[PDB]
Amino acid sequence: HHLRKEVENHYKLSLPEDFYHFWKFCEELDPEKPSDSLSASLGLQLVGPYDILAGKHKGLNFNLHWRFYYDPPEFQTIIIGDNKTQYHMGYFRDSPDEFPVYVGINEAKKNCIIVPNGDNVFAAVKLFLTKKLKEITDKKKINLLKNIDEKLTEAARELGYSLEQRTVKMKQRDKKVVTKTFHGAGLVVPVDKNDVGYRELPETDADLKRICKTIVEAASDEERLKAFAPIQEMMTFVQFANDECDYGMGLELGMDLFCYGSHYFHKVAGQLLPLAYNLLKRNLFAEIIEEHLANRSQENIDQL
Ligand code: NA
Numbered sequence: 001h002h003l004r005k006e007v008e009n010h011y012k013l014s015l016p017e018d019f020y021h022f023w024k025f026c027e028e029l030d031p032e033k034p035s036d037s038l039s040a041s042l043g044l045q046l047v048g049p050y051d052i053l054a055g056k057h058k059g060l061n062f063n064l065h066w067r068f069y070y071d072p073p074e075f076q077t078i079i080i081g082d083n084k085t086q087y088h089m090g091y092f093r094d095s096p097d098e099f100p101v102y103v104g105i106n107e108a109k110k111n112c113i114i115v116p117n118g119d120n121v122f123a124a125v126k127l128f129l130t131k132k133l134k135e136i137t138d139k140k141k142i143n144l145l146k147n148i149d150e151k152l153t154e155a156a157r158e159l160g161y162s163l164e165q166r167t168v169k170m171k172q173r174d175k176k177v178v179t180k181t182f183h184g185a186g187l188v189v190p191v192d193k194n195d196v197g198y199r200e201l202p203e204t205d206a207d208l209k210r211i212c213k214t215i216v217e218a219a220s221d222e223e224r225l226k227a228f229a230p231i232q233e234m235m236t237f238v239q240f241a242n243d244e245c246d247y248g249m250g251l252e253l254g255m256d257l258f259c260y261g262s263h264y265f266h267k268v269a270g271q272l273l274p275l276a277y278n279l280l281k282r283n284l285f286a287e288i289i290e291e292h293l294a295n296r297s298q299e300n301i302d303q304l
Contacts, residue, residue, distance in 0.1 A: 001020060001023065001024075001053055003052055003053050003055060004020065004053075006052055007049045007052045007053060010049075010052055010057070010062045011048075011049055011062050011076065012096070012284055013076065013093070013096060013284070014099060015049055015091075016091070016099045016100055016120065017159075018120035018121050018122055018159070018161060019049065019078070019091075019121060020053075021122075021155070021159055022121045022122060022125075023046075023050065023053050025122075025151075025152075025155050026038065026046065029148075029151070034046070034053075034054065035047070035050050035051070035054045035056075038125065038148075041141070041144050041145060041148055042081075042125070042128060042129060042132055042145075042148075043081050043082060043132075044079055044080070044081050044125065044128065045079065045080050045081075046078065046079055047065075047066045047077060047078065047079065047080050047088075047301070048062075048065060048066045048076060048077045048078050048090075049076070049078060050078060050079075051065070051066075051303060056303055057303065060302055061291060061302060062302065063287060063288045063291050063292070064291060064292060064295060064300060064302060065077075065300065065301065065302040065303075066080065066088070066300055066301060067288075067292055067300050068086055068088055068106065068108040068300060069086075069108045069261065069296060069297075069298055070106055070108050070111075070112040070183065070258075070259060070261065071090065071106070071108075071292075072114075072183065072255060072258065072259075072289075073273075073277070073282075073284070073285035073286075073288035073289050073292070074092050074093050074094060074185070074285065075090040075091075075092055075104060075106070075114065075185075076090050076091045076092075076093070076100075077089070077090040078090055078091060078103075078121065079121070079124070079125070081128075084109065085107040085108075085109050085110055086106075086107055086108035086109045086110075087105065087106075087107045088105065088106060088107075088108070089103055089104070089105045089117060089121075089124050089128075090103070090104055090105075090106075091103060091104075092104040092114065092185060094173075094187075094188040095188075095282055096282055096283070096284035096285060097282075100119075101119070101169070101170065101173050102116050102117070102118065102119040102167075102170050102173075103116075103117045103118050103119065103120065103121055103123070103124040104116060104117060104185055105117045105124070106183075108298075112182055112183045112259040112260075112261060113183055113184050114183045114184060114185035115184075116165060116166055116170060116185070117165060118162070118163065118164065118165055118167070119162065119167045119169060119170055120156075120161045120162070122152055122155060122156040122159070122161045122163070123156065123161060123162060123163045123164065123165070125152060126149065126152045126153065126156065126163050127163070127165055129145055129148060129149050129152065130149070132145065133145050133146075133149070173186075173188065174186065176188045178191060178197075178198040178248050178252075179198070179200070179248070179252050180205075181252055181255045181256055181259060182205065182209075182255070182256045182259035182260065183255070183259050187248060187251055187252055187255065189247060189248035189251065189280060190280075191248075196244070196245050196246065197245065197246060197247065197248055198246055198247075198248035198249060198252075199241050199246040199248070199249045200249070201234065201249065201252060201253055201256075202234065202237065203230070203234075205256070208256055209260070211227070211230050211231065212257070212260045212262065212265070214227045215227040215228060215231070215262070215264055215265075216262045216264055224264070231257075231268060234253055235250075235253070235268065235271070235272070237249070238250035238253060238272065242275070242276075242279060247276055247279045247280050248276075248280075250272045250273075250275065250276040251272070251273070251276040251277070251280070253272055254268070254269045254271075254272030254273035254276060254289075255273070257269045257272070258273065258289070258293075263296075266293045266296070269289075269293060270289075270290065270293050273285075273286070273289040273293075274286040274289055274290050277289065
């Protein structure tokens with residue numbers, strides 16, 4: 001596609017082959033409006049990089065474009081669904097220098113959880129379709145979805161794409177996950193044979209969430225200052241961890257605070273996440289998190 005290098009220059013990210021093949025699939029499906037080809041049948045719409053392939057881009061910050069409230073920098077939205085739940089799908093990359101490891105989904109009006117949904121967009125839409133078909137009570141819609149299901153399956157078969165929700169390479173990546181974080185999709189950082197690269201937080205996730213709850217529910221600013229004391233302490237622990245190259249600890253603390261979702265945590269998360277991503281040489285993610293924390297909206301299409 002003639003707009004390919006424009007996609008990767010604007011996002012500063014490399015897109016996998018499934019991204020481009022799926023565009024051609026949707027073009028054939030509805031050449032008048034490829035990004036809306038699944039809208040009547042599935043309630044889905046292609047967005048983010050697809051907007052560039054569609055030429056819809058012709059101040060424009062693609063680090064924020066269709067970035068929903070709980071999308072960590074690893075998560076790049078490509079498809080949106082029901083706006084009542086803010087259902088959407090995105091490629092998930094552990095590093096800006098790698099291809100996506102899978103397609104994740106989140107409902108931003110419900111929670112911060114990122115659910116795996118295949119390792120390519122053909123799988124992601126097929127899995128969505130299978131689930132959507134369970135709700136359909138109209139014979140014409142049933143017929144339409146079965147046809148689309150047949151086309152997706154054959155296209156995936158011809159390209160050699162798995163249609164499984166979790167593939168082998170995905171289950172292999174989970175072996176590298178040093179912690180789940182609050183969103184459950186996992187952090188992957190380099191860890192050498194002496195465990196250097198990561199160390200655990202002093203609190204469990206349930207206890208960290210309890211600490212966060214006492215901060216947001218503090219009845220006065222003085223009580224909130226006191227409720228912050230365990231966070232301030234953990235940030236000191238992160239500084240020591242950074243001095244000994246255990247960069248993943250501050251990444252995990254910052255990610256959990258971001259995922260909890262309170263504006264009371266934007267300042268500390270802005271002190272943890274940019275530094276951690278820079279120390280990990282994931283500089284683009286440091287840019288994304290800075291710009292997102294400065295503009296963490298519930299409306300996010302940069303094309304207005
Ligand atoms: Na965690």
